[PDB]
Design an enzyme around this catalytic site. Structure first.
Site, short mmCIF file in Angstrom:
data_model
loop_
_atom_site.label_atom_id
_atom_site.label_comp_id
_atom_site.label_asym_id
_atom_site.label_seq_id
_atom_site.Cartn_x
_atom_site.Cartn_y
_atom_site.Cartn_z
N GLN A 1 0.69 -1.25 0.07
CA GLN A 1 0.06 -0.01 -0.42
C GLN A 1 1.41 1.52 -0.19
OE1 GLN A 1 -3.72 -0.37 1.88
NE2 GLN A 1 -3.46 -2.03 3.22
N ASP B 1 -3.75 -14.17 5.82
CA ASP B 1 -4.42 -13.85 7.43
C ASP B 1 -5.41 -13.44 6.74
OD1 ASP B 1 -2.31 -12.20 5.64
OD2 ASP B 1 -2.75 -10.91 7.94
N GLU B 2 -6.31 -13.35 8.08
CA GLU B 2 -6.97 -12.55 8.34
C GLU B 2 -8.28 -12.49 7.38
OE1 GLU B 2 -5.32 -8.65 9.68
OE2 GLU B 2 -5.20 -9.51 11.45
N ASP C 1 0.73 0.06 8.73
CA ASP C 1 0.39 0.24 8.92
C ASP C 1 -0.49 1.84 9.05
OD1 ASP C 1 -0.88 -2.60 10.53
OD2 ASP C 1 0.04 -2.39 12.20
C1 LIG Z 1 -0.27 -11.09 9.18
C2 LIG Z 1 -0.75 -10.57 10.36
O1 LIG Z 1 0.74 -9.48 11.06
N1 LIG Z 1 -1.11 -10.24 9.88
C3 LIG Z 1 -1.90 -8.38 9.85
C4 LIG Z 1 -0.66 -7.77 9.46
O2 LIG Z 1 -2.13 -6.76 8.01
C5 LIG Z 1 -0.42 -6.39 7.25
O3 LIG Z 1 -1.54 -5.37 6.68
C6 LIG Z 1 -0.39 -4.76 5.80
C7 LIG Z 1 -0.52 -3.46 5.92
O4 LIG Z 1 -0.06 -2.55 7.07
C8 LIG Z 1 -0.91 -5.19 4.29
O5 LIG Z 1 -2.41 -4.67 4.47
C9 LIG Z 1 -1.03 -6.90 4.64
O6 LIG Z 1 -1.53 -7.30 3.73
C10 LIG Z 1 -1.79 -7.54 5.62
O7 LIG Z 1 -1.14 -8.71 5.47
C11 LIG Z 1 -0.79 -6.10 10.21
O8 LIG Z 1 0.25 -5.18 9.42
C12 LIG Z 1 -0.05 -6.53 11.70
C13 LIG Z 1 0.45 -5.14 12.33
O9 LIG Z 1 -0.38 -4.43 13.04
O10 LIG Z 1 -0.70 -7.19 12.32
C14 LIG Z 1 -1.70 -8.34 11.88
O11 LIG Z 1 -3.16 -7.95 12.24
#
Ligand SMILES: CC(=O)N[C@@H]1[C@@H](O[C@@H]2O[C@H](CO)[C@H](O)[C@H](O)[C@H]2O)[C@H](O)[C@@H](CO)O[C@H]1O
Length: 633
Positions: A161, A291-292, A438
């Site tokens: 990003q 993830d997520e 972030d």
């Molecule tokens: C695996 C992980 O830690 N996932 C979360 C992270 O999410 C990432 O966020 C970034 C941008 O900051 C990208 O969008 C990436 O695709 C996502 O995986 C997050 O950055 C971290 C630390 O806050 O924690 C997790 O929630």
């Protein structure tokens, strides 16, 4: 008077040394040093000697040592003397040294570095650089052989990003090399160029030429650069302009972050991106994230995925089976290209009809099912990516505390949430810190570099040596500061022009100037307009992670922020950091001006730049706006 005078020992070996002469520290430590008689001194006439095949390593070490020590050190072939550093590659020493380990012998034959591979020799030269760059050119005699406990040691660098500048990446790879770290997971966008993917060429991106350049630098340093394209969640930067591939919820509302894994054209889109990356990364791995996917919601709001799971994986299949099926289908796809898949652990969950393929590396960051111990029982290969090793620019819960981990006995088998597994598990690959942007205006990338220093030395120590030879963290800290950064970081010209008053013709659409430039602690400039008394900011435009990513966004004048304060001043972060500019000198000598947080470049808009953002808004032709460097060279 005291009669204080430099000792000034002759160069080369001496049989005489005082018994407790300091041995300069290294990071990782080289444990089990056996002391010998006397000491060796780098001095006039010292050379770096090697075979022809090692010539480039010898030359690069001689130039580097010449800079740190002020002594003219040349590289040579043929016979070494006691005045010299010798490099030897002896591939028969795999059992003692493995693929990355090295031995130093310091004695009457000079300073010998031996590795079983080219990267092993290069890693021993890093310890020679560290030992000689701390103000002491005499090293106690003796011998040590050292090899890393774990095979994968490094960082996640999320350049997603927002853009992390390639100059930053090049410094980071030099720092990783210095600390013997051999793994960087780079989540990033490689600019998509095909008709079918090109509407995702929004910023941040990296060009193929720039990726090939840092991959070549990484590979010379022994670093595996692994791309990630996160899927099927966190896909906003790819799906924003492809709503046809976005997953809709039961009410029909689409999320640009979610790939519709039930749509075969959406799956083919993802595979198309994999094939695009294939030609510029050299690694044998593909990281698809995972993830997520359902953060902020649940599979219950996506009934279409249960229907899909049942058709694809049989009656009783659940959305978790469809999710795991998608990962296994990507595993199949990358394996056919000769790669091994890797994912984050969290979405690995409770399946019925499908089981996750065991040949997928699991990077474990989130105590979310299974526990580490369960995954060990099943025989999965695991890398420790604990949140204890996270930094985020905005999420203050994530700031590595190296003192705490050093003093509390964390090791590479200490998985997320203090869940200990056997650190000798034969499929534990190693461990990594993770560097996440972030909300990205709270810290510039140069402040991120200052902050991660200690945590990068901590992870280097615990993954190679797995030992705590310093009685406490504060003792390690004193030595890592003495060791300092590698040469490339000390040589980077962060602020190539002096503070002062400048004419800047590129800025005439904003003001006729002139402009007063001052430098900031983090290596940038504030530019004040002497006409209005306001300062140039890149402040306005469409954003990701609260940073302006819009190609063609225009800068503006705003009341001058205080750019002299540190990142703890979070309440004024955005005004302050939108006012920081990075100036770089061309090869050779023209200057480009970049917003520090966006890492696009200011240019006069021609109207001929071609980019998906510009299809829907363009800055007025001839005004100054930011653009990715590739659209303006
Ligand atoms: C695996 C992980 O830690 N996932 C979360 C992270 O999410 C990432 O966020 C970034 C941008 O900051 C990208 O969008 C990436 O695709 C996502 O995986 C997050 O950055 C971290 C630390 O806050 O924690 C997790 O929630």
């Amino acid at each position: 008077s005291s009669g204080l005078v430099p000792r000034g020992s002759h160069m080369g070996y001496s049989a005489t040394a005082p018994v407790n002469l300091t041995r300069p520290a290294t990071v990782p430590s080289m444990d089990g040093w056996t002391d010998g008689t006397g000491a060796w001194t780098l001095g006039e006439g010292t050379r770096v000697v090697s075979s022809d095949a090692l010539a480039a390593r010898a030359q690069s070490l001689a130039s580097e040592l010449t800079k740190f020590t002020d002594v003219d050190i040349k590289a040579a072939t043929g016979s070494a003397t006691g005045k010299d550093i010798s490099l030897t590659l002896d591939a028969s020493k795999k059992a003692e040294l493995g693929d990355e380990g090295f031995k130093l012998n310091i004695g009457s034959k000079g300073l010998e570095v031996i590795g079983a591979t080219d990267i092993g020799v290069f890693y021993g030269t890093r310890s020679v650089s560290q030992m000689l760059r701390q103000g002491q050119l005499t090293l106690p005699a003796g011998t040590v052989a050292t090899k890393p406990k774990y095979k994968e040691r490094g960082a996640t660098l999320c350049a997603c990003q927002i853009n992390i500048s390639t100059d930053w990446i090049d410094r980071f790879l030099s720092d990783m090399a210095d600390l013997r770290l051999n793994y960087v997971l780079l989540e990033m966008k490689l600019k998509p160029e095909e008709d079918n993917t090109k509407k995702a060429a929004t910023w941040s991106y990296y060009t193929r030429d720039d990726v090939k350049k840092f991959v070549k630098k990484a590979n010379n340093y022994g670093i595996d650069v692994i791309p990630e394209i996160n899927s099927p969640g966190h896909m906003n930067v790819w799906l924003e302009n492809y709503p046809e591939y976005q997953l809709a919820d039961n009410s029909g509302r689409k999320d640009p972050n979610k790939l519709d894994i039930s749509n075969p054209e959406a799956v083919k889109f993802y595979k198309t991106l994999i094939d695009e990356y294939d030609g510029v990364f050299t690694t044998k791995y593909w990281h698809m994230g995972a993830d997520e996917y359902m953060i902020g919601t649940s599979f219950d709001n996506y009934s279409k995925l249960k229907t899909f799971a049942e058709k694809q994986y049989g009656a009783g299949a659940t959305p978790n089976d469809a999710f795991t099926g998608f990962i296994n289908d990507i595993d199949k796809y990358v394996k056919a290209k000769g790669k091994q898949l890797r994912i984050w652990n969290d979405g690995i969950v409770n399946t019925k009809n499908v089981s996750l393929n065991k040949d997928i590396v699991i990077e474990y960051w989130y105590g979310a099912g299974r526990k580490p111990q369960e995954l060990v029982q099943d025989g999965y290969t695991l890398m420790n990516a604990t949140q204890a090793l996270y930094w985020s620019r905005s999420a203050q819960v994530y700031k590595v505390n190296a003192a705490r981990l050093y003093n509390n006995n964390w090791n590479v088998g200490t998985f997320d949430g203090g869940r200990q597994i056997d650190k000798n598990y034969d499929k534990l690959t190693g461990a990594k810190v993770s560097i996440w942007p972030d909300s990205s205006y709270f810290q510039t990338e140069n402040e991120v570099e200052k902050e991660i220093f200690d945590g990068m030395r901590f992870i280097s120590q615990m993954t190679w040596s797995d030992s705590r030879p310093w009685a406490t963290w504060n003792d390690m800290k004193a030595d890592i500061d003495k060791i300092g950064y590698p040469l490339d970081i000390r040589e980077y010209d962060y602020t190539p022009v002096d503070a002062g008053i400048y004419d800047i013709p590129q800025l005439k659409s904003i003001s006729k100037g002139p402009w007063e430039l001052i430098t900031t602690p983090d290596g940038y400039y504030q530019m004040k307009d002497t006409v209005s008394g306001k300062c140039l900011a890149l402040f306005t435009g469409s954003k990701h992670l609260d940073v302006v990513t819009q190609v063609g966004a225009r800068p503006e004048l705003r009341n001058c922020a205080d750019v002299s304060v540190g990142q703890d001043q979070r309440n004024t972060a955005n005004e302050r950091n939108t006012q920081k500019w990075q100036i770089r000198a061309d090869k050779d000598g023209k200057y480009t001006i970049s917003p520090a947080l966006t890492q696009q470049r200011l240019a006069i808009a021609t109207g001929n730049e071609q980019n998906i953002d510009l299809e829907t808004h363009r800055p007025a032709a001839g005004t100054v706006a930011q653009f990715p460097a590739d659209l303006v060279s």
